[PDB]
């Protein structure tokens, strides 16, 4: 109870900022997450013994892949922490509980391959889950870990509160399927502009939480340039492995996954910022004004990719 987590001064200050990088010391990431739960949710939200056992089981079930790894899980949870802390009174007690856990669990047991590669491979998961294949798997893995003895961090919730929080986590994790993002943002855009957007309407909250999940998931594009640029290498390390595996199935991959087309990465990032990232943080900033620093950092990184193309870096 009286056992707080405390970070060194630089981390205590910088963790509050959207653009915080969790650093290369893996052994500090569990402490960083508990710190964020305690400040976001409270020292009472979870039994520390159960939370610590949940965290280490989640870590164990992330794989040693270039990008979709334990560091990504904690990075996405921190972006959610920053949004929740800058939007104090907008979110319920259960929502703050659910979303930090949802973010930590959102890519559980990722193999570094897209839904599309699972389908073309004819992976068993593609027969079990026809759409949002990996995301249904990520939710399935979350429930499994929650049901390990001593791992049920929600035990002190009532039956209906427990069902509500698992429903928050399920929708939050499905929403990280980027294929669903385009339509979710368009609906939120129309709702905001026509003025029909209502945060007491559960279906509306669900959409807002979905966009928050996309925003946290894409948050590598909202870091300082050197972090964004170095994270890009890990992202493309996976894309190019998938492209290799597409070639082994006798299918030319999209250029984004074809390592022979490394040259075109700068223009590819531009399209992505313009088509996905900037739209995402613009709509998020309209709905939740205090998330504007994510939009600003994203615009700064767009400007940096424009400089790469112009030969200035
Ligand atoms: C559209 C395009 O075309 C090229 C390209 C490159 C080289 C040659 C020819 C084309 N590159 C891109 C953009 C690449 N791209 C896609 C998602 N992310 C991303 C950013 C943060 N998270 N994620 C993310 C990663 C995995 C899964 C989900 C999300 C990302 O960087
Ligand atoms: Mg994912
Ligand atoms: Zn992710």
UniProtKB/Swiss-Prot annotation:
The active site is at 68 (proton donor). Keywords: Allosteric enzyme, cAMP, cAMP-binding, cGMP, cGMP-binding, Cytoplasm, Disease variant, Hydrolase, Metal-binding, Nucleotide-binding, Phosphoprotein, Repeat. Changing residue 107 to N: Reduces activity 1000-fold. One of its GO terms (molecular function) is 3',5'-cyclic-AMP phosphodiesterase activity. One of its GO terms (cellular component) is glutamatergic synapse. 3',5'-cyclic GMP binds at residues 68, 269. Residues 1-312 form the PDEase domain. GO terms for biological process: cAMP catabolic process; cAMP-mediated signaling; cGMP catabolic process; negative regulation of cGMP-mediated signaling; regulation of adenylate cyclase-activating G protein-coupled receptor signaling pathway; regulation of cAMP/PKA signal transduction. Abundant in the putamen and caudate nucleus regions of brain and testis, moderately expressed in the thyroid gland, pituitary gland, thalamus and cerebellum. 3',5'-cyclic AMP binds at residues 68, 269. A divalent metal cation 1 binds at residues 72, 106-107, 217. It is found in: Cytoplasm, Cytosol. A divalent metal cation 2 binds at residue 107. Changing residue 107 to A: Loss of activity and of zinc binding. Its main location: cytoplasm. The keyword DNA-binding does not apply. The tandem GAF domains bind cAMP, and regulate enzyme activity. The binding of cAMP stimulates enzyme activity. Composed of a C-terminal catalytic domain containing two divalent metal sites and an N-terminal regulatory domain which contains one cyclic nucleotide-binding region. Homodimer. Belongs to the cyclic nucleotide phosphodiesterase family. Plays a role in signal transduction by regulating the intracellular concentration of cyclic nucleotides. Can hydrolyze both cAMP and cGMP, but has higher affinity for cAMP and is more efficient with cAMP as substrate. May play a critical role in regulating cAMP and cGMP levels in the striatum, a region of the brain that contributes to the control of movement and cognition. It is linked to Dyskinesia, limb and orofacial, infantile-onset: An autosomal recessive, early-onset hyperkinetic movement disorder characterized by axial hypotonia, dyskinesia of the limbs and trunk, orofacial dyskinesia, drooling, and dysarthria. The severity of the hyperkinesis is variable. Striatal degeneration, autosomal dominant 2: An autosomal dominant disorder characterized by striatal degeneration and dysfunction of basal ganglia, resulting in hyperkinesis. This is cAMP and cAMP-inhibited cGMP 3',5'-cyclic phosphodiesterase 10A. The lineage of its organism: Eukaryota, Metazoa, Chordata, Craniata, Vertebrata. The chain holds residues 724 to 1036 of 1055 of the full protein.
């Amino acid at each position: 109870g009286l056992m707080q987590f405390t970070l060194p001064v630089r981390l205590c200050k910088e963790i509050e900022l959207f653009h915080f990088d969790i650093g290369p010391f893996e052994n500090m990431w569990p402490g960083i997450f508990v710190y964020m739960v305690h400040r976001s949710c409270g020292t009472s939200c979870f039994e520390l013994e159960k939370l610590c056992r949940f965290i280490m089981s989640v870590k164990k079930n992330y794989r040693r892949v270039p990008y979709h790894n334990w560091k990504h899980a904690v990075t996405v949870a921190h972006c959610m922490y920053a949004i929740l802390q800058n939007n104090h009174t907008l979110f319920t007690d259960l929502e703050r509980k659910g979303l930090l856990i949802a973010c930590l669990c959102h890519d559980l047991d990722h193999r570094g391959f897209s839904n599309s590669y699972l389908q073309k491979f004819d992976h068993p998961l593609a027969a079990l889950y026809s759409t949002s294949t990996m995301e249904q798997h990520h939710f399935s893995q979350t429930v499994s870990i929650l049901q390990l003895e001593g791992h049920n961090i929600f035990s002190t919730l009532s039956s209906s509160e427990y069902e509500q929080v698992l429903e928050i986590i399920r929708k939050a994790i499905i929403a990280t399927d980027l294929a669903l993002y385009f339509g979710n943002r368009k609906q939120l855009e129309e709702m905001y502009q026509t003025g029909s957007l209502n945060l007491n309407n559960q279906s509306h909250r669900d959409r807002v939480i979905g966009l928050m999940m996309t925003a946290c998931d894409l948050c590598s594009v909202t870091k300082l340039w050197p972090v964004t640029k170095l994270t890009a290498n890990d992202i493309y390390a996976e894309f190019w492995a998938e492209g290799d595996e597409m070639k082994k199935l006798g299918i030319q991959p999209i250029p984004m996954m074809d390592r022979d087309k490394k040259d075109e990465v700068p223009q590819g990032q531009l399209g992505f910022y313009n088509a996905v990232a900037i739209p995402c943080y613009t709509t998020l900033t309209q709905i939740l004004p205090p998330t504007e620093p994510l939009l600003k950092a994203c615009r700064d990184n767009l400007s940096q990719w424009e400089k790469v193309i112009r030969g200035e870096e």
